Amino acid sequence: SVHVPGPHAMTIQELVDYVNARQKQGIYEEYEDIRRENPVGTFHCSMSPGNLEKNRYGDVPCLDQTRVKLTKQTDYINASFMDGYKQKNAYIGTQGPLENTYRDFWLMVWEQKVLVIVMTTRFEEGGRRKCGQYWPLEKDSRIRFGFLTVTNLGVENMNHYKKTTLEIHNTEERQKRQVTHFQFLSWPDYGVPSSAASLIDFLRVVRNQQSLAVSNMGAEPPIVVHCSAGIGRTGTFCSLDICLAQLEELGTLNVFQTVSRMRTQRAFSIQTPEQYYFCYKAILEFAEKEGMVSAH
Ligand SMILES: [Cl-]
Ligand SMILES: [Cl-]
Ligand SMILES: [Cl-]
């Protein structure tokens, strides 16, 4: 995995000092330094014939080096393998499926043996389309995508997310699998969450379901995470997961390293300076909530 502890990881004490030193503007400037670096890799497949129309945004291709290939038309989906903390291919980061890519998305989920899907947007926000209706919304509804039929087995609404259990039936291989679809509901239309508590609780729900599902699946597959373009909220979610994992195991983390590394796999991960600052602030809010912080 690209996500190894260090070199140069920081304790919470060190992180407090770091962020105090730089303030909001210094952390924004740090994001701009990241953003100014040329990507590590190329984007030729994304932009090729047959594939352009499969991107939600022309300015957000995916890297050639880490793209998820479909085994079947083309092999292309705008989706990237992403490492997690000491874990190869912990995530697939992807855009909100489009009508013409719903079948590709489900083929990816089947081929990659995905058990959990994490959605961090609504279908439309502020009149901006972010995701198509690629799954059956109500219990017992289904959608057929050629040889993959997806059936809704139940929905539960929580205060900050909703959980939908889906059955994917591959009618060619004659096999069925359950996939859990989690939609986070408390990301605001503007800006970043005012508190990270619900997002971190949601992360814990997702982690636990992944663990449970993997334990039951029999002789890990990635978690699919999406937002509009698969870079902003997706990158934030994954980055916080990685940093909290390291903070759990060793009591250290490094946001700069995490985001820099992630961007070599899902290009453009972390879309705004507010998202970058949120990664720092969320971790410090967490530290406080966990009773790890003394103030001046
Ligand atoms: Cl965009
Ligand atoms: Cl759409
Ligand atoms: Cl988004």
Numbering used by the authors: 277 to 348, 354 to 500, 508 to 584
Please give me the paper's original passages concerning this structure.
In the first category are TCPTP, SHP1, SHP2, BDP1, LYP, PEST, PTPBAS, DEP1, MEG2, and GLEPP1, which have a “PTP1B-like” accessible pocket that harbors a basic residue corresponding to Arg24 of PTP1B. This pocket has the potential to accommodate pY at the +1 position as in PTP1B or potentially other acidic or phosphorylated residues in positions N-terminal to the substrate pY. The new structural data and analysis presented here suggest that a secondary substrate-binding pocket, similar to that found in PTP1B, is present also in SHP2, BDP1, LYP, SHP1, TCPTP, MEG2, PTPBAS, DEP1, and GLEPP1. PTPs with particularly high enzymatic activity against generic substrates were RPTPσ and PTP subgroups R5, R3, NT1, NT2, NT3, NT4, and NT5. The subgroups NT1, NT2, NT3, and NT5 exhibited a pronounced preference for acidic residues N-terminal to the phosphorylation site.
Protein tyrosine phosphatases (PTPs) play a critical role in regulating cellular functions by selectively dephosphorylating their substrates. The ∼280 residue PTP catalytic domain consists of an α/β structure, and biochemical and structural studies have led to a detailed understanding of the catalytic mechanism (Barford et al., 1994; Zhang, 2002). Key features of the domain include the PTP signature motif, the mobile Trp-Pro-Asp “WPD” loop that in the closed conformation positions the conserved and catalytically important aspartate residue, and the phosphotyrosine recognition loop. Here we report the crystal structures of 22 PTP domains, including two tandem-domain RPTP structures and a detailed structural comparison of this protein family.
